[PDB]
């Protein structure tokens, strides 16, 4: 039995350019008022090969919590190109929207992200130097991979 | 007559065709494990299969199977068990002209189940309706998944769907604390609050002193003797995780008691983590308990009905199931082929009957 | 170079037997327990449960993997697809 | 100084059957090593949790319920929110 739970997560700007900020309309539910707050992290897996090229894009705090259904906006900054290998940047990768209460991670949502060139010519003949201003990201919102850890609250 | 019963529920103008293949009630293995020092109760099994098909054109004879559902019926001296084994669609129902936004398959399932319940209801005998819902691509129609118009529901979708199918049948009785009835849902991995979300909306407005939908297992309604080992308290259906697990557990026996599961609650606690229930999708066990007041020889007469031998039934069903439904034409061909095969198995020139809806609401 | 297409599932079933052989899995579990430096061992029912959860985990992970491979507009899954499926699930 | 690893004893055909079950259509030849790696990692985690719980319980054998306890710490994974 969890106190807090997600009812849905809408993605506002999609498909957006790669460097555009991440904006999520998050809709969750609360059963009772809590002492601490909710913490929301948004990690970007720059490279799947290692758990090193992960970048925590942002972290919003939400407190206190109203009993019932709640919506809110979540803005986060685009990932750093200097921490991404220029090889695995264009293609498929993963983002992780995590939520914790008083530090204890209790919800983890996973989305697939496809990076793609805007023109067909650039897709057919990709330059060795990545054209960042011509790269849009398309994230799959139809099947969010939701994992629910049961934790202690108050 | 099932054709009529189904005709009453379907929308006006909707013309379909049904084939109902059944078998004679024959002795079988006991649905429940035998308590120690006792012989198993004698059980009579009886197969059933409904195949609903339509026509892409009103004039020509092109026939296409849109839906198929199989039901086993168990009969012991104190219990009638209606088990829904498999149910699948081909998704070519979109070929039907002016096919209403109404849930046709839900109505067909509902009507079929209702018919079986009514025609198999015995005087002063408890009747149970069990089923096991899990969303998968195809069950009965191979390659139907590759038909772009076939839309298979997800986990929660299929569970909610079966609950909406079962709900109205339950509504036709009186609440339990005249004929009474209660519904039991179990979704492994879900607490009662989360499970209640799968209930029909009607359950929200029931009397809190005598609800209709429960998140539990009908123990004291299935087994008069709760002191019996847990193994004798759970039905052993064909193609069912409950059965597999019960066997794996029975491997521990040398008393009647297992070694790793001493109670039913433990059994379900374990069931929530088996291979079928935790593969990334949700899964739902469902039961409908019906208590009676105080607790050609066939009820179906339509020409769609054919009563075959056990062997012949298996022949027909297995024939239909190992077909192809990748395309329209393949599905048509398969429908015709199976139709002819059934006609041959029942020593007739034709088996099946047309049905037209009377309901205009 | 070893690339294999898998047999079409003509029809699914509801309950399915496990796919990994009992003894290999068992001796693997004994190895893992051994290397964790412990002097206790698992019940047969417990190893049963372990295998159930292992194969469940694997089927799900393969679902995610197939999904990732689809999103790369491919049919053949690769190593990277599995790594991505792991991260997607919520691993590190 | 090099001993055997039983994880290489989990045959490829079983892996491919698991993949088929997961809905995969075609696989690469150079995938099995990674698969074995993932399997072994998960199994490691669950075994370690369950063993820990058993040890603290001051018992000499891991019961199936201890494994359940261990798996409850693995969280529950689904599609969508409902």
Inter-helix orientation angle D12-21/C44-71, to 10° = 70
Q: Which residues of C60-88 are buried (b: 16+ CB within 10 A; e: fewer)?
A: bbbbbbbbbbbbbeeebbbbbbbbbbbbb
Max Cα–Cα distance, chain D, nearest Å: 53
Number of domain units in chain A: 1
Chain D interface test: which of B273, B274, B281 (most D C-beta within 10 Å): B273
Are A62 and A72 in contact by the 8 Å Cβ rule? The answer is: yes
Contact status of B29 with chain C (Cβ, < 8 Å):
no
For residues D30 and C79, what is the distance between their CA atoms, to the nearest angstrom? 7
For residues A28 and A8, what is the distance between their CA atoms, to the nearest angstrom? 7
Q: Which residue has the tokens 């199918």?
A: B165
Chain A interface test: which of C74, C79, C90, C92 (most A C-beta within 10 Å): C90
List the Cα angle B352/B102/B284 in 5-degree steps. Answer: 85
Are D56 and D27 in contact by the 8 Å Cβ rule? The answer is: no
Residue B239 — left, alpha, or beta (φ > 0 → left; ψ -120 to 50 → alpha)?
A: left
For residues A102 and A126, what is the distance between their CA atoms, to the nearest angstrom? 45
3-class secondary-structure state, position A118: coil
Among candidates B243, B249, B260 on the partner chain, residue whose Cβ is nearest the Cβ of C15: B243
Q: Which residues of A85-118 are buried (b: 16+ CB within 10 A; e: fewer)?
A: eeebbbebbbbbbbbbbeeebbbbbbbbbbbbbe
Q: List CB contacts (< 8 A) between A7 and chain D.
A: 81-82
Pick the CATH number of C1-92 from 1.10.20.10, 2.60.120.10, 3.90.1010.10, 1.20.1510.10: 1.10.20.10
Q: Which residue has the tokens 């046709």?
A: B104
3-class secondary-structure state, position A99: strand
Supply C36's token pair.
Answer: 């964790």
Q: Per-domain residue ranges for chain C?
A: 1-92
For residues B9 and B25, what is the distance between their CA atoms, to the nearest angstrom? 28
Supply A6's token pair.
Answer: 């997600």
Are B326 and B147 in contact by the 8 Å Cβ rule? The answer is: yes
Catalytic residue among B88, B167, B240, B300: B240
Question: Based on C-alpha coordinates, what's the Rg of chain C?
Answer: 16
Distance from CA of D10 to the nearest CA of A (A): 24
Are B317 and B20 in contact by the 8 Å Cβ rule? The answer is: no
Tell me which residue range forms the domain holding B34: 1-361
Give the contacts of B223 (CB within 8 A, at least 6 positions apart): B32, B232, B233
Number of domain units in chain B: 1
For residues B154 and B137, what is the distance between their CA atoms, to the nearest angstrom? 10
Inter-chain CB proximity A147 and D77 less than 8 Å:
yes
C-beta atoms surrounding A46 within 10 Å: 21
Give, in order, the Cα–Cα distances in Å from D18 to each of A145, B211, C31, D14, D31: 20, 42, 22, 6, 13
Inter-chain CB proximity A114 and C90 less than 8 Å:
no
Kindly report the length of chain C: 92
Give, in order, the Cα–Cα distances in Å from B41 to each of B32, B44, B217: 8, 10, 22
Q: Which residue has the tokens 């020889």?
A: B297
Give, in order, the Cα–Cα distances in Å from B17 to each of A45, B86, D47: 54, 20, 56
CB pairs under 8 A between B and D: 28
Are C26 and C45 in contact by the 8 Å Cβ rule? The answer is: no
Among candidates B142, B243, B279 on the partner chain, residue whose Cβ is nearest the Cβ of C10: B142
Are B53 and B66 in contact by the 8 Å Cβ rule? The answer is: yes
- Whether B347 is catalytic: no
Q: List CB contacts (< 8 A) between B239 and chain C.
A: 13-15
DSSP β-ladder status, A104-117 and A135-139: antiparallel
Nearest CA-CA partner of B275 in C73, C13, A107, C75: C13
A-side interface with C, Cβ within 8 Å? 45, 48-49, 51, 91-94, 96, 108, 110-112, 114, 140, 143, 145, 147
Kindly report the length of chain A: 154
Q: Which residue has the tokens 């990732």?
A: C68
Max Cα–Cα distance, chain C, nearest Å: 49
Give the contacts of B335 (CB within 8 A, at least 6 positions apart): B53, B63, B64, B65
**DSSP letter, residue C15:** S
Number of domain units in chain D: 1
Are A139 and A111 in contact by the 8 Å Cβ rule? The answer is: yes
- List the determination method: X-ray
What's chain B look like in SS3? CHHHHHHHHCECCCEEEEEEEEECCEEECCCCCCCCCCCCCCEEEEEEEEEEEECCCCCCCCCEEEEEEEEEEEEECCEEEEEEEEEEECCHHHHCCCCCCCCHHHHHHHHHHHHHHHHHCCCCCEEEEEEEECCCCCCCCCCHHHCCCCCCCCHHHHHHHHHHHHHHHHHCCECCCCCEEEEEEECCCCCHHHHHHHCCHHHHHCCCCCCCEECCCCCCCCCCCCCCCHHHHCCCCCCCHHHHHHHHHHCCCCCCCCCCCCCHHHHHHHHCCCCCCCCCCCCEEEEEEEECCCCCCCCCCCCCEEEECHHHHHHHHHHHHCCCCCCHHHHHHHHHHHHHHHHHHCCCCCCCEEEECCECC
Among candidates D19, D43, D64 on the partner chain, residue whose Cβ is nearest the Cβ of C46: D64
Q: List CB contacts (< 8 A) between A96 and chain C.
A: 87, 90
Kindly identify which residue of chain C lies nearest to residue B318, measuring between CA atoms: C11
Q: Which residues of B17-36 are buried (b: 16+ CB within 10 A; e: fewer)?
A: bbbbbbbeeeeeebbbbebe
Supply B127's token pair.
Answer: 């009747």
Supply A138's token pair.
Answer: 């398309």
Supply B190's token pair.
Answer: 């879900």
Q: Binding site for CoA, residues of B?
A: 87, 89, 105-106, 151, 161, 164
For residues B110 and A49, what is the distance between their CA atoms, to the nearest angstrom? 51
Question: Which long-range contacts does B193-200 make (Cβ < 8 Å, 24+ apart)?
Answer: B193/A1, B197/D82, B198/B156, B198/B159, B198/B160, B198/B163, B198/B284, B199/B163, B200/B163, B200/B164, B200/B167
Among candidates A91, A94, A147 on the partner chain, residue whose Cβ is nearest the Cβ of C72: A91
Nearest CA-CA partner of B318 in B131, B120, B70: B70
3-class secondary-structure state, position A131: coil
Query: Sign of the CA dihedral A104, A109, A112, A113?
Result: negative
For residues B128 and B287, what is the distance between their CA atoms, to the nearest angstrom? 7
CA dihedral C5, C10, C16, C21 (to 10 degrees): -30
Kindly report the length of chain D: 82
Distance from CA of A146 to the nearest CA of C (A): 8
For residues B139 and D82, what is the distance between their CA atoms, to the nearest angstrom? 25
CATH number of the domain that D54 lies in? 1.10.20.10
Q: Which residue has the tokens 């909306």?
A: B201
Give, in order, the Cα–Cα distances in Å from B315 to each of B21, B309, B334: 11, 9, 15
Are B347 and B308 in contact by the 8 Å Cβ rule? The answer is: no
Supply A111's token pair.
Answer: 């989305």
3-class secondary-structure state, position D35: helix
3-class secondary-structure state, position C38: coil
Are C1 and D30 in contact by the 8 Å Cβ rule? The answer is: yes
Inter-chain CB proximity B270 and D80 less than 8 Å:
no
CA dihedral B306, B309, B311, B317 (to 10 degrees): 20
Nearest CA-CA partner of B13 in B97, B130, B138, B110: B97
For residues D63 and D50, what is the distance between their CA atoms, to the nearest angstrom? 9
Tell me which residue range forms the domain holding D9: 1-82
Nearest CA-CA partner of B324 in B134, B87, B93, B145: B145
CATH number of the domain that A150 lies in? 2.60.40.1490
For residues B297 and B292, what is the distance between their CA atoms, to the nearest angstrom? 24
List the Cα angle C79/C82/C85 in 5-degree steps. Answer: 155
Inter-chain CB proximity B136 and C63 less than 8 Å:
no
C-beta atoms surrounding A71 within 10 Å: 11
* Omega of the bond leading into C43 within 30 degrees of 0 (cis): no
For residue C28, what is the enclosing H or E element? Answer: helix C22-35
Tell me which residue range forms the domain holding A82: 1-154
For residues B242 and B270, what is the distance between their CA atoms, to the nearest angstrom? 11
């Amino acid at each position: 039995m969890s106190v807090v739970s997600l009812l849905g997560v809408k993605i506002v700007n999609n498909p957006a350019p790669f460097l555009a900020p991440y904006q999520f309309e998050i809709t969750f539910e609360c059963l009772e008022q809590l002492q601490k707050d909710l913490e929301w992290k948004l990690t970007y897996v720059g490279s799947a090969t290692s758990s090193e090229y992960d970048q925590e894009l942002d972290s919003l705090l939400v407190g206190p919590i109203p009993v019932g259904v709640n919506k809110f906006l979540f803005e986060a900054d685009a990932p750093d190109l200097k921490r991404i290998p220029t090889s695995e940047i264009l293609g498929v990768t993963v983002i992780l929207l995590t939520c914790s209460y008083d530090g204890r991670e209790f919800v983890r949502v996973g989305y697939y992200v496809n990076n793609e060139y805007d023109s067909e010519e650039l897709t057919q003949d990709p330059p060795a130097k990545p054209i960042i201003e011509r790269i849009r990201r398309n994230i799959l919102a139809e099947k969010p991979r939701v994992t629910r850890f049961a934790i202690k609250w108050d | 007559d099932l054709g009529d019963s189904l005709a009453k529920v379907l929308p006006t103008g909707v013309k379909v065709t049904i084939r109902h293949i059944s078998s004679a009630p024959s002795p079988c293995v006991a649905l429940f494990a035998a308590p120690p020092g006792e012989e198993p109760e004698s059980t009579f099994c009886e197969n059933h299969f409904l195949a609903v098909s339509i026509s892409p054109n009103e004039n020509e004879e092109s026939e296409v199977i849109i839906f198929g559902i199989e039901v086993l019926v168990y009969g012991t001296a104190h219990l009638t068990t209606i088990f829904v084994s498999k149910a699948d669609s081909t998704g070519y129902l979109h070929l039907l002209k002016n096919a209403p936004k109404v849930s046709l398959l839900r109505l067909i399932s509902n009507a079929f189940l209702s018919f079986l319940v009514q025609t198999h209801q015995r005087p002063g005998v408890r009747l149970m309706v069990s089923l096991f819902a899990r969303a998968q691509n195809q069950y009965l129609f191979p390659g139907s998944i590759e038909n772009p118009e076939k839309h298979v529901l997800d986990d929660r979708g299929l569970i909610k769907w079966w609950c909406r199918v079962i709900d109205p049948i339950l509504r036709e009785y009186e609440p339990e604390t005249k004929s009474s009835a209660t519904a039991f849902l179990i979704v492994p991995g879900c607490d009662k609050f989360e499970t209640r979300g799968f209930f029909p909306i009607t359950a929200r407005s029931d009397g809190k002193d005598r609800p209709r939908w429960l998140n539990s297992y009908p123990l004291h309604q299935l087994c008069d003797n709760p002191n019996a080992p847990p193994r004798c308290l759970v039905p052993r259906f064909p193609d069912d995780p409950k059965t597999r697990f019960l066997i794996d557990l029975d491997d521990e026996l040398p008393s009647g008691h297992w070694r790793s599961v001493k109670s039913l609650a433990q059994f379900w606690e374990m069931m929530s983590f088996r291979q079928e229930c935790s593969a990334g999708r949700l899964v739902g066990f469902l039961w409908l308990v019906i208590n009676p007041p105080g607790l050609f020889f066939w009820p179906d007469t339509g020409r769609g009905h054919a009563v075959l031998s056990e062997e012949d039934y298996k022949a027909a069903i297995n024939f239909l199931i190992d077909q192809d439904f990748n395309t329209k034409h393949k599905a048509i061909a398969s429908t015709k082929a199976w139709a002819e095969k059934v006609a041959s198995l029942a020593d007739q020139l034709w088996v099946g009957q047309r049905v037209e809806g009377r309901n205009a609401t | 170079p070893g690339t294999v297409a898998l047999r079409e599932i003509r029809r699914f079933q509801k309950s399915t037997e496990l796919l990994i052989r009992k003894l290999p899995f068992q001796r693997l579990v004994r190895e893992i327990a051994q290397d964790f430096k412990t002097d206790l061992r698992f019940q047969s029912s417990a190893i049963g449960a372990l295998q159930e959860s292992v194969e469940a985990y694997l089927v799900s992970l393969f679902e995610d993997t197939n999904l990732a491979a689809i999103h790369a507009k491919r049919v053949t899954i690769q190593k990277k697809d599995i790594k991505l499926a792991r991260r997607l699930r919520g691993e590190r | 100084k090099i001993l055997r690893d039983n994880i290489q004893g989990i045959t490829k055909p079983a892996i491919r059957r698991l993949a088929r079950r997961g809905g995969v259509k075609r696989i690469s030849g150079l995938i099995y090593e990674e698969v074995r790696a993932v399997l072994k990692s998960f199994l490691e985690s669950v075994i370690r949790d369950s063993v820990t719980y058993t040890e603290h319980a001051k018992r000499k054998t891991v019961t199936s319920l201890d494994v359940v306890y261990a798996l409850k710490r693995q969280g529950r994974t689904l599609y969508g929110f409902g």
